[PDB]
Design a protein around this nucleic acid. Structure first.
Length: 336
DNA sequence: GGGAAGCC
DNA sequence: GGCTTCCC
């Protein structure tokens, strides 16, 4: 398997800089309501990092611009670029607006050197046609392609050939294993294991008592290099809309038209078929009821109306007391 | 099943 | 926020 993984570099801020060239070179930070969304690198070198209150941002980065978040344009860019990547790939799994996994194995016919050259070609094209720069990792499975991409930011072309895999898998701190953030890392680092391969010479059972059977297994077959969940033709990008009701009703014969309109425009922002539908509702006190059903086969818009109606009715059966103010729908797990 | 708690 | 695992 040859997996080329593409992650867009500080995306939002860069869509900005492309749109406003006079942002390029001076700190530019993007906001969500207020807190930091993305942030370019001239702004990074000053202590500006995602999720922090704009407060700290300004106090440590005063020469910085501060724009609001225009998501629709970013989604425009990510859409154009995903379509770029869809042409050089045999299979593509869209993980987010930011990132894609391409199985390009038949495209370079099993030849890793040709895969690397292809990644080069991809970068060149993305930057030529949309002035955007990406950080790429090339590897035999998804996880390593990613680990080497995150290790190759910014504007990088990371690389782990089959020859290198085992070696890499050795020298690899536990905290650099996606799915282990800060606390599990602290525990294992403080309870024995410092690096991935150290997991092998343990008792496994009392590793599950720290992580859970699943994630422990995953850590194994990764330490064993027995990992190869393949690249699926899917988008994990959520698509859905919320609509406010005239008053605070609690009656399906009023909500239904508003839910059916939420669905229609969620089912229109999506190319492909969803495997999950989630009905969401903001109650009187803004309390939110989330409730979704999964479908191994795709869900048609027509059957989506009925399934949603049932999800809703089931929600209102869960509440009985309060009424509904807003109505919402999310469509997930998308086959393409 | 599904609300609650903890970990990305 | 969303995914799991806990726990009723």
């Amino acid at each position: 398997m040859i997996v080329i993984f593409v992650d867009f570099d500080y995306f939002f801020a860069q869509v900005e800089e492309v749109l406003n060239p006079q942002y390029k070179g001076k700190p530019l930070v993007v906001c969500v309501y207020g807190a930091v969304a993305t942030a370019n690198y001239e702004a990074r070198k000053l202590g500006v990092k995602a999720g922090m209150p704009i407060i700290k941002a300004m106090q440590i980065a005063p020469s910085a611009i501060y724009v609001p978040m225009r998501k629709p344009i970013y989604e425009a860019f990510s859409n154009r670029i995903m379509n770029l990547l869809n042409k050089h790939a045999d299979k593509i799994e869209v993980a987010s607006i930011d990132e894609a996994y391409l199985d390009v194995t038949n495209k370079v016919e099993g030849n890793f050197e040709n895969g690397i050259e292809l990644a080069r070609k991809i970068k060149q094209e993305i930057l030529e046609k949309e002035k955007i720069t990406v950080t790429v990792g090339v590897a035999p499975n998804k996880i390593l392609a990613k680990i080497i991409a995150d290790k190759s930011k910014p504007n990088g072309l990371g690389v782990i050939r089959p020859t290198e895999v085992q070696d890499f898998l050795n020298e690899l701190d536990i905290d650099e294993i996606p799915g282990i953030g800060s606390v599990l890392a602290r525990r294992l680092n403080e309870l024995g294991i410092q690096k991935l391969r150290d997991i092998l010479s343990k008792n496994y059972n009392e590793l599950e008592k720290i992580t859970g059977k699943a994630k422990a297994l995953y850590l194994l077959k990764l330490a064993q290099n027995k990992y190869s969940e393949p690249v699926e033709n899917k988008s994990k990008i959520p698509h859905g809309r919320y609509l406010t009701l005239p008053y605070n009703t609690r009656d399906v014969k009023v909500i239904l038209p508003y839910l059916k309109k939420a669905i229609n425009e969620a089912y229109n922002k999506v190319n492909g078929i969803p495997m999950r539908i989630t009905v969401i509702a903001i109650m009187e006190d803004l309390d939110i009821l989330s409730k979704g059903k999964k479908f191994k086969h795709g869900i048609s818009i027509d059957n989506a109306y009925k399934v949603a109606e049932d999800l809703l009715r089931e929600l209102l059966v869960r509440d009985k007391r309060r009424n509904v103010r807003r109505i919402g729908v999310k469509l997930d797990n998308i086959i393409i």
